[PDB]
Each structure stands twice: as C-alpha cells, then as structure tokens.
Predict the 3D structure of the following.
Amino acid sequence: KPFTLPILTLGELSNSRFPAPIDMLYTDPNEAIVVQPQNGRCTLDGTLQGTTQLVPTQICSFRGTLISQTRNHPLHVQLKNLDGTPYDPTDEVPAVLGAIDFKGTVFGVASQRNTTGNSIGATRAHEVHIDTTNPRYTPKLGSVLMYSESNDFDDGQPTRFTPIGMGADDWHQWELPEYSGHLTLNMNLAPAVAPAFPGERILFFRSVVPSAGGYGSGHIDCLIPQEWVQHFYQEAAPSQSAVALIRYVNPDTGRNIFEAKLHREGFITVANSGNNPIVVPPNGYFRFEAWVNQFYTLTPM
Amino acid sequence: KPFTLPILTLGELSNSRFPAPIDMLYTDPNEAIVVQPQNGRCTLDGTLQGTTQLVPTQICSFRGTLISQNHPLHVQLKNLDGTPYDPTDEVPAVLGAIDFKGTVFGVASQRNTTGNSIGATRAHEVHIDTTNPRYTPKLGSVLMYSESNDFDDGQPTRFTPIGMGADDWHQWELPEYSGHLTLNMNLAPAVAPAFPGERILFFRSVVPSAGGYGSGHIDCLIPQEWVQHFYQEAAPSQSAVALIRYVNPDTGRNIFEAKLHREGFITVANSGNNPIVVPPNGYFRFEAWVNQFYTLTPM
Ligand SMILES: C[C@@H]1O[C@@H](O[C@@H]2[C@@H](O)[C@@H](O)[C@@H](CO)O[C@H]2O)[C@@H](O)[C@H](O)[C@@H]1O
Ligand SMILES: C[C@@H]1O[C@@H](O[C@@H]2[C@@H](O)[C@@H](O)[C@@H](CO)O[C@H]2O)[C@@H](O)[C@H](O)[C@@H]1O
C-alpha cells in the first residue's frame, strides 16, 4: 500500500496541538531545538502516540464532572475521556487523550448541562482558565483544576472545557507539564525529536492563537497537521524506510519548491538556509517522492 | 478512481456545521423533513457547495476588522483563511458563516496590528443573533454584542463560536444573509427523502449553552472528515446513489444499510420511533453503486 500525504493546502490544514488553522510554515531562526509534544504525534504508518486523539475540535479540551470544594473560584473537574468513555489512569498514555501538552495558562469556556438533580437540562457557560503548572493539573491521575471569575457552576454536573487561547503571557509550548503532579514523573511519552545532523531544522506547522490580554504571541507549533494524523491513522501504509523524501510542489505547474525529510516517527526536517521567512505558493502542498535514508543530504530550502 | 469513505468511528468524527465532535446518529422520530444547511455540503465527487469550507475548527467562525462599537461590535469581514472577502462571489455568504437562525455565543478576540499598542490583545464573551437585521455576512458585515467594552476599533477581530447564547435556535431555518432586503442566493439545494418510508440520517452534536434549557442540537448531513475526504479524492460518482453499510469491523456484521446520495446526504428506511444503537468501533463502508429503486432494509 503506497504511502501518501493529503493534498490540502496550508490554509486548508488544522493544527494538531490546538484547535486552530495553520497560518504558516516555520523553522527556528536561531538554532536547532529538541521538542517533545504529546498531541499531534502519529507515525507515518498510523500509530498514535502520546495524548494524541483524532478529533480536531477536541485538542486541549477536557470533559468530566465538577466536584465542589471541601476573585477566582476553583473548579475541580474529575475527568472522563473526550469521547465520553470512562478515563482509566492505568492506560499506557501520559494523560487523558487531548490534554494540554505544555506549560501555560489556557483560557477558554467551561459549560454544563445538568443530568441529575432538580434542574435536569439547565445549562450555563462562563470563561475559565487552566494553569497547567498548577500542582492540581493532574490529567494523568484524572482531574484538572480550572479557575473562573464566575461562581455560576453546579456541583456534580457534566462539565466541558473548550480552549480558546492564552489566559496569560506565560506559555512555554515545548515544556511538558507534570501530568501526575509534582511528585511523579511523566511516563508513556511520545519520544523527543530533533534533527539528526547539523544544518537541519525541524519544519513546523505554526498557528497564531488568541490571547485574553497582554502581548503574548500565541504561537503553537505542531509536527504534522491534524489532517495528516487522521490520514496516516486510516491508511496505515507500511513505512519502507526511516525517512520519506517529500517535496513542496505546485500541483498546477509541477514546480518543486523545496524538499524535506519526513521521518517515520512523524515529523519533518529541512536543510537550514538562513533566517529568511518561508514563502510557498498558496495552492501548494507536500507530496511524497521516495523512501530514502538518514544519509540523504537535503538541499537548503 | 474508486469511491471510498473514511473509516473513523462515530466518536472520531467532527460536525460539519459546528466545531464539535459527533455524539450520535439521528433520524426524525416523527416524520420526514426537508433541510437546506449551507455548511457541510459536499457532493460525493468532491464539489463543495453553500458556505462550506474545509477547516473543521473554523465552522461558524468569523474573521474581520472591528469598524465601530450590551455593547455593539460592528465587524467588517474577511475570509477565514485571511484573504479579502468579495461579496460578488457566487456563495450565499462568506464561507463558514452561521447557516441557521439563532443566538450563537462565543468569544471575540483581537491582536492589534496598527496604532499605539501593536501586539496588544484582548478577548471577551460575545453573542451573534443571526436574525438581527445587521447579520449580513453576504454583504460582508456582522453585528456582535458583548457585555465588555474592552475592544479596540480598527483592529483584527476573530469570533470563535461556543454554543447557544439563547434558547432560540432553529437549525433548519436559514438566516437572511443579506438582511431583510435581499433574498438568499447561490444556496446549496434543499434535500429530502425521495420516497415515503425513508428518513434523512443525521450526524448529531449536542453543543453547549450559556443558560436556559436549550437542547444544543446541531445535525449535519455528513461529517467534516467526509467533506475533506470527498474534496481530495474527487472520485467520479457512478450512479446517483451509493449503497453504504454501517459495519462492525471486528465481526464483519452489517448493522444497517443506507443510501448515500450523490448530492452528499444519507437516507435510511424508517423503522419506527426507534433509538439508534450502534457499536462504538463501527463505521460506514461503501458497498456498491445502486439506484433510487434499491429497497433499504428497515434500520
Ligand atoms: C495590553 C492590554 O491587555 C489587557 O489589559 C490588561 C488588564 O487585563 C490587566 O491585566 C492590567 C494589569 O496590568 O493590564 C492590562 O494591560 C486588555 O484588556 C487591554 O485591552 C490591552 O490589550
Ligand atoms: C437555567 C438557568 O439558566 C441561567 O440563568 C439565567 C440567568 O443567566 C438570566 O438569564 C435569568 C433571567 O431571568 O434567567 C436565568 O434562568 C444559568 O446561569 C443558571 O445556572 C441556570 O442553568
């Protein structure tokens, strides 16, 4: 079964680490880096890793039951899976699938629709934020702590968190949270990735997301877009080597813009060619060319 | 080129009319209906219709500039992908626009690009009443309302929908995309079962609500992944009707069968005021090209 990439253009793709369209391709203009995101992790032959799940509108969302305590009001959410199934902390995952995979304050909206009590069917929704550095950000153990200026939430009812953007200018998108809290190490992580040779850089799909105040840039970079995650998962094409050579092509003219290594683990490297911003034709997309190996030498893009 | 469907299960699919996962399959328990949604419209050979665009998180979003300022927020629109919006495009409205009558609540946000505080941001809850006379996304403008006056005129502004802003949704009643003046144009066609005893099968989401008892139902004809799939595959339709079966991949058992119409919607044979029970690992599979005379087994 031949390996293929979606034929969606850049403006037609979704970030796999935040619910947002892709705004541009991006390489670090300073140096090469090492990164270990847990959303947006899929091997070329279709193996999901980390906390990666398939629904683009559920990335960095949470679902569960509000548990009352004992100006910002604390909201302890006892989690279930995003698809509604019970959350099992013994699963071999770093945290509930879809959990926020970086240190920062994410603002969003928490909503409820009552299923028990004297007001079944009554609803409410308000802005909240989740600080993933909080010691009670413990999505591996099955709970997260939100905060809201509103006290208008009902104890014991189904509660959903939908992320919107930066709730403070404090994002560190490549620093993993402590998914089990302060006294347990992360486990079952998708591996760290980095260029294997000097002169290469990871190529990211970058989104710029909203911010609720301050001057935060809102950058969230993913290794492959969510549509690629969905595509590889369904195709499950055998990988014929550790490295697929791909090219950004203009499908209307056949012109090759630049080449890149698509690693079997599910990320892209390019040859460094300076701090120049990346400009591609808006009708262009990546196309699989051939299976190669690590000794392939990329031409500067 | 052979026609295929994605193999994603129900809990792995996205609504094409609202940014939400699919919760269940649904048919009208009362009668057959006629519907004309403008998002989630793609023919089986990959022709997008209505206001349908490809990005699942952008459905019912708006992007634009705040021109002037419950505090009113007048937004001059661009396309969601950032390109200028041309009101003479042969579309009912800017792609992704809300395609029903109701109050949609969400968050409006800004990041300044001009003036004395370039880079400064803000974001607050807002709502958009698509029955408002100034809900005119075809002309290129929408009116939002917010409790906060912390918004900057002349700056890029984005609306992200969350759910019901009031218990006033009519998901099958199209808004007046140009206001009370002009009739709607360039609409994706109405769809309905062609025979008594058939019903449209919907992919249903239950979305949030900011107060009241609204049900939050948003039904789409095909999920957004199917839209994306048909758009890319562009497989020629060999007949007006593809036979599809909802299958259990573990057992190979056909749970039920359905007609997938070339226009991009599904009908099933009515089997009474039946709740729909399907296995969580199941998905639809293309079986064969048939025709309108195919008799579906009652669901
Ligand atoms: C840059 C501004 O950000 C927000 O305002 C801030 C307030 O929310 C508050 O945190 C105070 C405390 O220092 O700082 C303000 O800058 C926005 O509300 C405002 O419109 C600006 O974008
Ligand atoms: C069912 C309830 O809805 C909301 O409360 C409403 C208020 O926000 C306000 O609109 C008043 C107007 O009279 O009506 C209330 O019903 C929720 O905030 C509340 O928690 C209930 O779910």
